[PDB]
Amino acid sequence: AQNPNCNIMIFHPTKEEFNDFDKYIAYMESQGAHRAGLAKIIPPKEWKARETYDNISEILIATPLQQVASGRAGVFTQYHKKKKAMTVGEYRHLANSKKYQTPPHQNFEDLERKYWKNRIYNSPIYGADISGSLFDENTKQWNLGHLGTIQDLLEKECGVVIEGVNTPYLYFGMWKTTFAWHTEDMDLYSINYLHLGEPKTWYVVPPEHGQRLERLARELFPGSSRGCGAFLRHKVALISPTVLKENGIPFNRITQEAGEFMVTFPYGYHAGFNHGFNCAEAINFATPRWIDYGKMASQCSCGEARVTFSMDAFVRILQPERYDLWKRGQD
Ligand SMILES: O=C(O)CNC(=O)C(=O)O
Ligand SMILES: [Mg+2]
Ligand code: NI
Ligand SMILES: [Zn+2]
């Protein structure tokens, strides 16, 4: 068995190996990469996503989200308070202001210590979930707006043609902006490219151990757990590495820098934070190996998780028993 300790693997494809996206994912899996739940891919030195980032300031962040925490430093939830629209230039200036800017620090480890000690006492503003792309149309390799669609993968594997579309999303971050513990919708893969700015630290639980994290979360968030049998789908709960270690939960961590891709694998729980002003692009995707995970994925039917148009068909075809209840949740 390849990668039996479920370590995060880092890959350095050549420009020739960067041509065929599906083939390289399958290669990484042949080496055991999926067992960690997360892999890093450093593009060949010849590649670029676009020529420059000098002209992005006029992108609108229609609904910036203020991430307000409740709980204790290592075990907390966040809610998203909607703020007035602002441009990416306005948001960058806000991220760099004395109130929001990254503090002085020694290295990534010191900054991580400071994040876990102090996150809850601040409410950073995240420009998350913005439909769009920063890849140049002429970038032919690993262009997240030109991937094969999940609807096409389902049709190729299973024969059934379904409605829906699959497009990327931009994330503009600042110091302490946070992504809560989650897997993807329908336990899909995700791919995330850090276009510019400061790093993003990730935490991940191996897919084979995801239920260990769920059982801890039910213990740590007992009211949420009674409200919903899949409340991590709400994407609100944070648990620190120290708390994970105290409770014996297997996990790994890694920091992504500008110019690097991360892939999350089906049922790989992940969480993390931004070091300072940055911009990432991410999209979900599927492979043949995903289908079985999609058929078994949990679902939120309490009404909180509320998701995309395209998830309807995935539930309807892969989980017809659950369909009726799930759709009541969505309506
Ligand atoms: O970057 C973020 O805030 C969150 N991203 C993801 O969860 C992902 O790419 O799967
Ligand atoms: Mg612009
Ligand atoms: Ni994710
Ligand atoms: Zn729910």
Mutate-to-test residue for ligand 1 from 126, 171, 193, highest number of ligand atoms within 8 A of CB: 171
132 alpha carbon – ligand 2 mean position (Å): 12
| Cβ atoms of residues 318 and 164 within 8 Å | no
Task: Say whether 275 counts as a known binding-site residue.
Answer: no
Q: Give dist(CA 129, CA 170) in Å, integer.
A: 6
Sign of the CA dihedral running 141, 145, 146, 152: positive
CA distances from 103 to 6, 99, 214, 275 (A): 33, 10, 33, 10
Sign of the CA dihedral running 122, 221, 319, 330: negative
Neighbours of 225 (CB within 10 A): 17
319 alpha carbon – ligand 1 mean position (Å): 25
Question: Among all chains, which residue has been given the structure tokens 């009211």?
Answer: 223
Q: Give dist(CA 145, CA 282) in Å, integer.
A: 9
| Cβ atoms of residues 166 and 283 within 8 Å | yes
- Which residue's CA is minimally distant from atom 7 of ligand 1? 179
Ligand nearest to the CA of 191: 1
Q: Which of 31, 46, 35, 29 is nearest to 6 (CA)?
A: 35
Atom of ligand 1 nearest to the CA of 184: 10
Task: Give phi and psi for 289, each to the nearest 5.
Answer: -65, -20
Q: Give dist(CA 154, CA 225) in Å, integer.
A: 32
- Which residue's CA is minimally distant from atom 3 of ligand 1? 179
Q: Which of 307, 317, 323, 56 is nearest to 195 (CA)?
A: 56
> Looking at the chain, how many residues does it have?
331
159 alpha carbon – ligand 1 mean position (Å): 30
Task: Say whether 200 counts as a known binding-site residue.
Answer: yes
Task: Give phi and psi for 158, each to the nearest 5.
Answer: -115, -10
Atom of ligand 1 nearest to the CA of 178: 3
Q: Give dist(CA 189, CA 187) in Å, integer.
A: 7
Q: Give dist(CA 34, CA 177) in Å, integer.
A: 26
Sign of the CA dihedral running 44, 46, 48, 52: positive
Residue 171, CA atoms < 13 Å, CB-side half-sphere: 21
Q: Which residues line ligand 1 (CB under 6 A)?
A: 171, 179, 190, 192, 264, 270, 280, 282
Burial class (CB in 10 A: 0-12, 13-18, 19+), 32: middle
Residue 177, CA atoms < 13 Å, CB-side half-sphere: 27
Q: Give dist(CA 7, CA 35) in Å, integer.
A: 7
Mutate-to-test residue for ligand 1 from 264, 274, 307, highest number of ligand atoms within 8 A of CB: 264
Q: Give dist(CA 160, CA 158) in Å, integer.
A: 6
| Those residues with Cβ within 8 angstroms of residue 60's Cβ, 6 or more apart along the chain or in another chain | 85, 86, 87, 88
Ligand 2 ion: Cβ-proximal residues, 5 Å cutoff: 56, 58
288 alpha carbon – ligand 1 mean position (Å): 22
CA distances from 138 to 131, 142, 145, 165, 227 (A): 20, 11, 11, 22, 48
| Cβ atoms of residues 27 and 113 within 8 Å | no
| Cβ atoms of residues 142 and 47 within 8 Å | yes
Task: Say whether 270 counts as a known binding-site residue.
Answer: yes
Atom of ligand 1 nearest to the CA of 179: 3
Taking each helix axis from N to C end, the angle separating 150-158 and 311-318, rounded to the nearest 10 degrees, works out to 20
CA distances from 53 to 49, 92, 129, 161 (A): 10, 13, 19, 38
CA geometry: angle 185, 189, 191, nearest 5 deg: 115
Strand order in the sheet with 269-274: 178-182, 269-274, 200-205, 252-256
CATH superfamily of 1-331: Cupin (2.60.120.650)
Tokens of 277: 């002003």
Mutate-to-test residue for ligand 1 from 61, 169, 179, 204, highest number of ligand atoms within 8 A of CB: 179
Ligand nearest to the CA of 173: 1
Tokens of 217: 């979360």
Task: Give phi and psi for 325, each to the nearest 5.
Answer: -60, -40
HEC profile for the chain? CCCCCCCCEEECCCCCCCCCHHHHHHHHHHCCHHHHCEEEECCCCCCCCCCCCCCCCCCEECCCEEEEEEEECCEEEEEEEECCCEEHHHHHHHHCCCCCCCCCCCCHHHHHHHHHHHHHHCCCEEEEEEECCCCCCCCCCCCCCCCCCHHHHHHHHHCCCCCCCCCCEEEEECCCCEEEEECCHHHCEEEEEEEEECCEEEEEECHHHHHHHHHHHHHHCHHHHHHCCCHHHHCCEEECHHHHHHCCCCCEEEEECCCCEEEECCCCEEEEEECCCEEEEEEEECCCCHHHHHHHCCCCCCCCCCCCCCHHHHHHHHCHHHHHHHHHHHC
CA distances from 135 to 2, 7, 17, 263 (A): 33, 30, 19, 17
Q: What is the resolution of this structure in A?
A: 1.4
Q: Give dist(CA 91, CA 175) in Å, integer.
A: 12
Q: Give dist(CA 77, CA 68) in Å, integer.
A: 8
Name the pairing type of β-strands 9-11 and 38-41.
Answer: parallel
For the chain, which residues make up each domain, given as ranges?
Answer: 1-331
Name the pairing type of β-strands 189-197 and 60-61.
Answer: unpaired
Task: Say whether 235 counts as a known binding-site residue.
Answer: yes
Task: Give phi and psi for 68, each to the nearest 5.
Answer: -95, 125
